[PDB]
CSV table of C-alpha atoms in Angstrom, one decimal:
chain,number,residue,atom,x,y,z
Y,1,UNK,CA,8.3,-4.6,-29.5
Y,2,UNK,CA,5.1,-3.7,-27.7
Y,3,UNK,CA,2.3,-2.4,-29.8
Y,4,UNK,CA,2.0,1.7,-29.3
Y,5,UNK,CA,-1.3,1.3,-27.3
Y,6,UNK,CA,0.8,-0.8,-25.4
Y,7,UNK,CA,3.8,1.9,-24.9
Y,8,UNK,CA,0.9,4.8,-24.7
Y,9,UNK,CA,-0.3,2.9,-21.7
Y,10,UNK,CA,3.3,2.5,-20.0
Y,11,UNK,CA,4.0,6.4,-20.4
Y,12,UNK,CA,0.4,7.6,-19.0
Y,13,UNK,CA,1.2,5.0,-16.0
Y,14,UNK,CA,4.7,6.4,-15.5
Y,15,UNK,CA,4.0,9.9,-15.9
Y,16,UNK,CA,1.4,9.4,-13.1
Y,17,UNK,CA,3.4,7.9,-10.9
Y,18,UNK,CA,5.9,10.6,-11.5
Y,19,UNK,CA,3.3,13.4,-10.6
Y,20,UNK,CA,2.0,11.6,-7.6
Y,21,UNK,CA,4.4,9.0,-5.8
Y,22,UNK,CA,6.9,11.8,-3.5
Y,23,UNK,CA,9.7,9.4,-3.6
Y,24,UNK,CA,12.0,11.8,-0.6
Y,25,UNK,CA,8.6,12.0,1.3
Y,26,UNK,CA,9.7,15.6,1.1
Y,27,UNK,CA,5.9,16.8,1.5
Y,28,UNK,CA,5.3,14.7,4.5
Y,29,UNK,CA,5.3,17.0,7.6
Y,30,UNK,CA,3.6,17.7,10.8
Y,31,UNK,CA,2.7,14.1,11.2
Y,32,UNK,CA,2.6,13.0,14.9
Y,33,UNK,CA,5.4,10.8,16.7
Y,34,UNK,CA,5.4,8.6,19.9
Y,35,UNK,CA,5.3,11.0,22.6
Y,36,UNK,CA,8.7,11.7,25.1
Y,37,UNK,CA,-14.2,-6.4,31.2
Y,38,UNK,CA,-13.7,-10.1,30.6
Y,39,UNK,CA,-14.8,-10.7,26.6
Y,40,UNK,CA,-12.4,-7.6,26.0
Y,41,UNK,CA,-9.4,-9.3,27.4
Y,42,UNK,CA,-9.8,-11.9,24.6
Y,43,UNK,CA,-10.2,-8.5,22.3
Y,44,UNK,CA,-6.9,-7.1,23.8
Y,45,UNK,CA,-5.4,-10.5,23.6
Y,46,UNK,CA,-6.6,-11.0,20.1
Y,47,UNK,CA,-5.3,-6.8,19.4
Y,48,UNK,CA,-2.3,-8.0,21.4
Y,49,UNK,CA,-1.5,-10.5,18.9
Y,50,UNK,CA,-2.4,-8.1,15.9
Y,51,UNK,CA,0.6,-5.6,16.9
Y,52,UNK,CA,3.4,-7.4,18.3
Y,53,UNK,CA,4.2,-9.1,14.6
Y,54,UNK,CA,5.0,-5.6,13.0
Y,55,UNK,CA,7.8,-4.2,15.4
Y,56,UNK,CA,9.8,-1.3,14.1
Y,57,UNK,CA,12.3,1.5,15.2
Y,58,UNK,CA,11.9,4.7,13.9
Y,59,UNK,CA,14.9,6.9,12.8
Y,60,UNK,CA,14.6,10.9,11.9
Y,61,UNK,CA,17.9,12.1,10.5
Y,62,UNK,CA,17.9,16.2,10.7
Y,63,UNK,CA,19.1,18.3,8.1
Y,64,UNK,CA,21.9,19.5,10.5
Y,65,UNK,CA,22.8,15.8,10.4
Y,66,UNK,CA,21.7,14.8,13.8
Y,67,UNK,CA,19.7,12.0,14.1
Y,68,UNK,CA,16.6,10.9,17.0
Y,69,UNK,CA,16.4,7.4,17.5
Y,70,UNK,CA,12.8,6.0,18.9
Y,71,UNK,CA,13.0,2.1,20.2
Y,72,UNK,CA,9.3,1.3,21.0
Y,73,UNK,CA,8.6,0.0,24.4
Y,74,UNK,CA,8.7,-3.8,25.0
Y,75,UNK,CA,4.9,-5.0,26.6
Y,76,UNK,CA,4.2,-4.4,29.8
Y,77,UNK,CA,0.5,-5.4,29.5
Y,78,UNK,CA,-1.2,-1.4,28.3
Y,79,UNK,CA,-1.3,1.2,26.4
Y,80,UNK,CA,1.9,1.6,25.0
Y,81,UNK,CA,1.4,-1.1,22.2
Y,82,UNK,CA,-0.8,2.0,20.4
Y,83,UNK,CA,2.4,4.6,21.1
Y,84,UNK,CA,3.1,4.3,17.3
Y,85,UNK,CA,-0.6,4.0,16.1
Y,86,UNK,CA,-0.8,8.0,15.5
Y,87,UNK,CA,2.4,8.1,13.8
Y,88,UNK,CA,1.3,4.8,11.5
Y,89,UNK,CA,-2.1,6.5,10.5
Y,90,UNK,CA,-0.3,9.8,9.8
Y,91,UNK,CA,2.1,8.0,7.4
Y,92,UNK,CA,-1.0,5.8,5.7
Y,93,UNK,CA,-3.2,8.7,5.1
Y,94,UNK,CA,-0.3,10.4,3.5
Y,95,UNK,CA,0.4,7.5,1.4
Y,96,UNK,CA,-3.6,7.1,0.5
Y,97,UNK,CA,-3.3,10.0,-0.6
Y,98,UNK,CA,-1.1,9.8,-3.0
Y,99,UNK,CA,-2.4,6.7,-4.5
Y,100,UNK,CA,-5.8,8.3,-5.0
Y,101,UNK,CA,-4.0,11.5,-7.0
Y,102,UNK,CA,-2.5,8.3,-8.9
Y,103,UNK,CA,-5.8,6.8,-10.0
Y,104,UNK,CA,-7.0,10.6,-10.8
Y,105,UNK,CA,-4.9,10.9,-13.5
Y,106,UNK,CA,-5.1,7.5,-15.3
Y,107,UNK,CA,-7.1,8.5,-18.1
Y,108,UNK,CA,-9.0,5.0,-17.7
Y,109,UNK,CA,-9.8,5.7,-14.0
Y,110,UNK,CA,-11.4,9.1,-14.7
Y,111,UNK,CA,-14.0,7.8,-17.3
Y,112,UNK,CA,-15.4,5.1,-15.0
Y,113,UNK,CA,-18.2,6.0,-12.7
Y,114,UNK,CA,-17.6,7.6,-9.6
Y,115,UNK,CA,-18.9,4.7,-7.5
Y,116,UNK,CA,-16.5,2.5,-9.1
Y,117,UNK,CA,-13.2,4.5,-8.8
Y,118,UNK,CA,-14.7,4.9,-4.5
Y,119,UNK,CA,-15.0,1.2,-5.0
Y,120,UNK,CA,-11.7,0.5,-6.4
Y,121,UNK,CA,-9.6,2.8,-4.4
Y,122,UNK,CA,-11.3,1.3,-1.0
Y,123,UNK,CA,-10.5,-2.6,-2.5
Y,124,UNK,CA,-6.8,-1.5,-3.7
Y,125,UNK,CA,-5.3,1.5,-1.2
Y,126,UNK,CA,-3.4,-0.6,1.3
Y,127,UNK,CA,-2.2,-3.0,-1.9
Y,128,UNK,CA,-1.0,-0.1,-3.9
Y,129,UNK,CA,0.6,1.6,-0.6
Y,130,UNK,CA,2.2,-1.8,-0.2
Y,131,UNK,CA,3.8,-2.1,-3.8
Y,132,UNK,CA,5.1,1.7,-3.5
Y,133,UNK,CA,6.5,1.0,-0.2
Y,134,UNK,CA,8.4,-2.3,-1.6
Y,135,UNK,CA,10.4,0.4,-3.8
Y,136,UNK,CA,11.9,2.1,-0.4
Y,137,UNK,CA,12.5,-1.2,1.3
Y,138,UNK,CA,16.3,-2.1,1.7
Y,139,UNK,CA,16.9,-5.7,2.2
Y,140,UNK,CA,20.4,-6.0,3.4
Y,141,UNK,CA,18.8,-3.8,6.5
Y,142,UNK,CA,15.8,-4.7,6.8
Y,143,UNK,CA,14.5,-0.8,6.6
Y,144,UNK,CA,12.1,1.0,4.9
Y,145,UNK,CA,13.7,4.5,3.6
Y,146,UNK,CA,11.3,6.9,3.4
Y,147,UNK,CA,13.5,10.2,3.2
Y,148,UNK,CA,14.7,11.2,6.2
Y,149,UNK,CA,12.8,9.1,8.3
Y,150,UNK,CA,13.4,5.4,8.4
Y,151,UNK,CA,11.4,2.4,9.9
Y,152,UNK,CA,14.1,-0.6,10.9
Y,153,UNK,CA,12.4,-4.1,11.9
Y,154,UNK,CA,13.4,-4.8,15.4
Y,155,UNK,CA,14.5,-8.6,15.1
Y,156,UNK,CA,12.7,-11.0,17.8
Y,157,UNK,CA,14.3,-14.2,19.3
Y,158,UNK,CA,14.6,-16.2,16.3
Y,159,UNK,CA,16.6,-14.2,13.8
Y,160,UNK,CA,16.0,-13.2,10.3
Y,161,UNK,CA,14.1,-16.6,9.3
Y,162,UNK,CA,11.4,-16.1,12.9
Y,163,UNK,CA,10.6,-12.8,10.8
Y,164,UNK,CA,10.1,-14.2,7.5
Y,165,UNK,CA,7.2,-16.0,9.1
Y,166,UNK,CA,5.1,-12.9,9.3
Y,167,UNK,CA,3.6,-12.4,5.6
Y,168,UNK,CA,3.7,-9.2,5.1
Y,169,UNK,CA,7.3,-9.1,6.0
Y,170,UNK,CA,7.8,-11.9,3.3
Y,171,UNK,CA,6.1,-10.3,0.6
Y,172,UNK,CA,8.5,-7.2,1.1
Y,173,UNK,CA,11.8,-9.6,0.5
Y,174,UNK,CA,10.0,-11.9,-1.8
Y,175,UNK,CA,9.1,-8.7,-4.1
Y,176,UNK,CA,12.2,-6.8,-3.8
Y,177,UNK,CA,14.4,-10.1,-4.9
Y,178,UNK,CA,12.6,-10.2,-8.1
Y,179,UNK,CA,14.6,-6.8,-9.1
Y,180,UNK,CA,11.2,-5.2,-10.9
Y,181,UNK,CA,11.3,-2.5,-13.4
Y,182,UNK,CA,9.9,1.0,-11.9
Y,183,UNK,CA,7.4,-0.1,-15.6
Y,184,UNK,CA,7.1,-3.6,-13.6
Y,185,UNK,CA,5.5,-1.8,-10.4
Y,186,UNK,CA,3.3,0.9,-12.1
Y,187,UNK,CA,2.1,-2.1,-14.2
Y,188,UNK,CA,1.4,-4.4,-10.7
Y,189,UNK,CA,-0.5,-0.8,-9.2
Y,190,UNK,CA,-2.7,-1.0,-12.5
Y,191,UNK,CA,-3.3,-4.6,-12.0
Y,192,UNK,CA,-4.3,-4.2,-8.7
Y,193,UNK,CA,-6.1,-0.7,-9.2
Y,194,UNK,CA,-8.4,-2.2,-12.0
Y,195,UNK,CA,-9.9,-5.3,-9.9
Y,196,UNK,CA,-13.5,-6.8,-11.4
Y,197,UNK,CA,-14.5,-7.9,-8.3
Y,198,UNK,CA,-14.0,-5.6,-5.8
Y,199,UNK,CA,-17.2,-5.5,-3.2
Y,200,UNK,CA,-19.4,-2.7,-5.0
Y,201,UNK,CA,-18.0,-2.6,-8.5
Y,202,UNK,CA,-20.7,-2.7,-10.9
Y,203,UNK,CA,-18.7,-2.1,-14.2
Y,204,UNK,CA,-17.1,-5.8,-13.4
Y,205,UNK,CA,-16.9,-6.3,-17.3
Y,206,UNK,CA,-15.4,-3.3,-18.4
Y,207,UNK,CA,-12.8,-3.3,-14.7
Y,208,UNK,CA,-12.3,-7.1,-16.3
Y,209,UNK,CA,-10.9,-5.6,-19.5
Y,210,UNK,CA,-8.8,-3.1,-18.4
Y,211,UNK,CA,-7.1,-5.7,-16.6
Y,212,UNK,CA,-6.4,-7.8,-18.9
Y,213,UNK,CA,-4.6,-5.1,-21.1
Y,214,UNK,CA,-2.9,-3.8,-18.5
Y,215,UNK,CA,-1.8,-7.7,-17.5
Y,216,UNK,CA,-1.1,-8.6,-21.3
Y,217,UNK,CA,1.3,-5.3,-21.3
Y,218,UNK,CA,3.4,-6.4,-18.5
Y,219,UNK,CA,3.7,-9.7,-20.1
Y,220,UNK,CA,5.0,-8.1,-23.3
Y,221,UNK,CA,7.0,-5.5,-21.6
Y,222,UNK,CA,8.5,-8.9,-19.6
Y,223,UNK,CA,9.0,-10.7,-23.4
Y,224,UNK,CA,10.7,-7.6,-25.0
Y,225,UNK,CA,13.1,-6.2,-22.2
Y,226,UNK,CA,14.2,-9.2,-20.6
Y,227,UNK,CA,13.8,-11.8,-23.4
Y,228,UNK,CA,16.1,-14.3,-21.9
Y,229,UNK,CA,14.9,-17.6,-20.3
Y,230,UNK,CA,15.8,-16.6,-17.3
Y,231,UNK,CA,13.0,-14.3,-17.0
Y,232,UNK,CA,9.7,-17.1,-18.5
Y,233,UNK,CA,8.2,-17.2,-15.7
Y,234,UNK,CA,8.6,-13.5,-13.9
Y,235,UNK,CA,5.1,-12.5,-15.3
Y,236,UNK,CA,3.3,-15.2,-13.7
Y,237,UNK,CA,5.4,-14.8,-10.5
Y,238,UNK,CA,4.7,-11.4,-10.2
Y,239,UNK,CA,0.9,-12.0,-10.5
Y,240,UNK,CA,1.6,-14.8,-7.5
Y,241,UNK,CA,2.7,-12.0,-5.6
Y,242,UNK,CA,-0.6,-9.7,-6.6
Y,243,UNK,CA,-2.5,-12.8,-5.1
Y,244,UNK,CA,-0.9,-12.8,-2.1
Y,245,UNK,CA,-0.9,-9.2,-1.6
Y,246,UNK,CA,-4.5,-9.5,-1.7
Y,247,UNK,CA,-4.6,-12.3,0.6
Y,248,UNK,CA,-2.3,-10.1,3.1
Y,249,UNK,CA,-5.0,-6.9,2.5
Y,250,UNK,CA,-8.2,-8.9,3.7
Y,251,UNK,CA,-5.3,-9.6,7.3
Y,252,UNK,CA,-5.1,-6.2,7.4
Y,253,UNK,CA,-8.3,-4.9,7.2
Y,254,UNK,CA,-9.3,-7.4,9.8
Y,255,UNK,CA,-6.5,-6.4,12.1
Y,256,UNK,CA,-6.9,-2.6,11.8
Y,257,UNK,CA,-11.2,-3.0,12.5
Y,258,UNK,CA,-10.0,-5.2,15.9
Y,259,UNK,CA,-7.5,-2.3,16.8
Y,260,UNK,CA,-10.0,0.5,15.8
Y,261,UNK,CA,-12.5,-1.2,18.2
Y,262,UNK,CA,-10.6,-1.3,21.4
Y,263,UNK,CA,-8.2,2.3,20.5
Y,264,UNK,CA,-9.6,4.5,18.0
Y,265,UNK,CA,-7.0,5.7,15.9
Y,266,UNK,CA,-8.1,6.2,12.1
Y,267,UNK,CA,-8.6,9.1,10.5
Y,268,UNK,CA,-11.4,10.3,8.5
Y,269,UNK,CA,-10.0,9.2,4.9
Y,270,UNK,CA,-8.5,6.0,7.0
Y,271,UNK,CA,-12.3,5.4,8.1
Y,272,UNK,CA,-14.0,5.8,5.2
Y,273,UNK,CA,-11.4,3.6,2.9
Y,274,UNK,CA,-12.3,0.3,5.4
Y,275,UNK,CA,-15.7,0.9,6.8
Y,276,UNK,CA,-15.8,2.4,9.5
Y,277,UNK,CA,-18.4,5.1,11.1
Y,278,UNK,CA,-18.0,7.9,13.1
Y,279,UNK,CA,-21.2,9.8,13.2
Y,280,UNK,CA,-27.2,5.8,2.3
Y,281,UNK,CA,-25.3,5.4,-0.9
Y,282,UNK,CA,-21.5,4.6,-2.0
Y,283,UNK,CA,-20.8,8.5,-2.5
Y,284,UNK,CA,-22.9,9.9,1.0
Y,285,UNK,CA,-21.0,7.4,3.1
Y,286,UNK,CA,-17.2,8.3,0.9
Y,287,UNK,CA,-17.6,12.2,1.0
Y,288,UNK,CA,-14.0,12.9,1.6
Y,289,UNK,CA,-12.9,10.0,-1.1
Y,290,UNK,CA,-15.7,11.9,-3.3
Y,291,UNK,CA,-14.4,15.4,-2.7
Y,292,UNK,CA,-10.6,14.1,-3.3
Y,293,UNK,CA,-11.9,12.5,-7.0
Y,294,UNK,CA,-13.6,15.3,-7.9
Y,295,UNK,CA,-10.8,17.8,-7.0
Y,296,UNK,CA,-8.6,18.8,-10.0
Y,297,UNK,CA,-5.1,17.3,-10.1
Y,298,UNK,CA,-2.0,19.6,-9.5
């Protein structure tokens, strides 16, 4: 068995998750859809580059039982490679969202310093976004389910394996094969969430701890509910998968800065979670973050 600390810790995980991840995205509404000199061509090749890998159809199913279908343009050389840039942000900031109401409530989170949970929600959003977003992924169709809307990945000239180059698209069927626990995932967010070294986290040693609790109660929960063989090595598999993750975040971040550059498309939270201005210490440049911590929970 796990140790009651151990199952104390699984239930306050759960029950946030359960308060704070809207699996029907049944609260997402009035979010926007596509509509009916020199050095910056090396910028717009480069941001060129940064889009065309993550291709996806967008499908809204009515309640009447209609559905709109959007195919995104192929590239003509403009604009519309950003058509789905206010949607995307729109759907992130909804997610972000949610993953800082999820942090709120972890008893653990709370009682560090206010800094720290700004630095740790700014190191781990996208990564925690990503791991509830792998619970809504379908791999037999290659389609995120997100309620009534669904995102489909709009196969290029290869086939299935020319996509599985693209590592974020790998993670997604990598992490979905292993068949995780809902525990499994909640676990993963915690490991992610409670990161020593995150830029600006000064309570490394304590963050360090946490950590390792929350890591040694996924490898129990692994040893006492799937105690077979088969499962040795799913711990350390899924903590493969954290690395990478984190490898695919610092990508991302890049990616989204280039973007941001050239097309400005962030929102205020989506600004302040990865640096960017729009206008001296951790809390006056995170005000929205800050407000959203210090809110109380629903």
């Amino acid at each position: 068995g796990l140790t009651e600390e151990q199952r104390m810790m699984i239930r306050e995980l759960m029950d946030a998750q359960m308060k704070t991840f809207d699996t029907t995205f049944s609260h997402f509404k009035n979010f926007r859809l596509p509509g009916v000199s020199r050095e910056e061509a090396a910028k717009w090749s480069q941001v060129r580059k940064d889009l065309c890998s993550l291709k996806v159809s967008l499908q809204l199913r009515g309640e009447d039982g209609s559905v709109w279908n959007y195919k995104p343009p192929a590239d003509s050389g403009g604009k519309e490679i950003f058509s789905l840039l206010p949607h995307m942000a729109d759907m992130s900031t909804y997610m972000f969202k949610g993953i800082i109401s999820f942090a709120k409530v972890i008893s653990y989170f709370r009682d560090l310093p206010i800094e720290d949970q700004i630095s740790l929600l700014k190191g781990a959003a996208f990564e925690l976004c990503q791991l509830r977003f792998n619970t809504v992924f379908n791999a037999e169709t290659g389609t995120w389910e997100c309620g009534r809307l669904s995102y489909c990945l709009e196969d290029t000239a290869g086939g299935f394996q020319q996509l599985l180059l693209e590592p974020m698209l790998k993670f997604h069927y990598m992490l979905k094969k292993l068949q995780l626990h809902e525990e499994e995932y909640v676990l993963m967010q915690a490991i992610s969430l409670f990161s020593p070294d995150r830029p600006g986290v000064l309570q490394h040693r304590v963050v360090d701890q946490l950590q390792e609790q929350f890591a040694i109660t996924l490898k129990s929960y692994i040893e006492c509910n799937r105690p077979q063989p088969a499962h040795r090595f799913l711990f350390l598999k899924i903590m493969a998968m954290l690395t990478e993750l984190r490898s695919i975040n610092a990508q991302h971040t890049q990616r989204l800065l280039r973007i941001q550059d050239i097309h400005p498309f962030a929102t205020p939270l989506m600004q302040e979670l990865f640096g960017i201005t729009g206008s001296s210490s951790l809390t006056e440049r995170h005000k929205i973050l800050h407000r959203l911590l210090q809110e109380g929970s629903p």
